[PDB]
Structure 1
Amino acid sequence: NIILRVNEDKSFLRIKDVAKVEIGAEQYNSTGRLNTSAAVPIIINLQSG
């Protein structure tokens, strides 16, 4: 719904008219597999000492 501009006819231009907004991950680059099954891998590092 965000209005980019008025358009000289009181009919607002909108982000929807020029784009497709959706919720989605910032980086789709990496995935994780556990025994051939999707999973997210959380690595726990040990603190020093």
Structure 2
Amino acid sequence: FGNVILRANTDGSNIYLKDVAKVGLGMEDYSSSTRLNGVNTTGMAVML
């Protein structure tokens, strides 16, 4: 993804996506989080 070509120049060198942004794995949302006794944990809530 960092080697995605944003523009190609006649010289031969391109402007890549890594030249304007930082690319990496993350999460599709950052709303909520949970802790169990102050320790970061992954949690699910089961609704009946």
Q: TM-score, normalised by structure 2?
A: 0.74
1:15 match: 17
Structural RMSD (CA): 1.3
Q: Displacement, 1:22?
A: 1.0
How many positions carry a matched residue from both structures?
Answer: 46
Task: Please tell me whether Structure 1 or Structure 2 has the larger radius of gyration of its CA atoms.
Answer: 1
What amino acid is aligned across from residue 42 of structure 2 in structure 1? V
Task: For structure 1, list consecutive stretches of 5 or more residues without a partner in the other structure.
Answer: none
Q: Which has the higher contact order (CA 8 A, sep 6+)?
A: 2
| Percent identity between the two aligned chains | 46
What amino acid is aligned across from residue 36 of structure 1 in structure 2? G
Q: TM-score, normalised by structure 1?
A: 0.73
Give 2:26's match in structure 1, choosing from 20, 24, 27: 24
Say which structure is richer in strand. Answer: 2
1:36 aligns with 2:38: yes
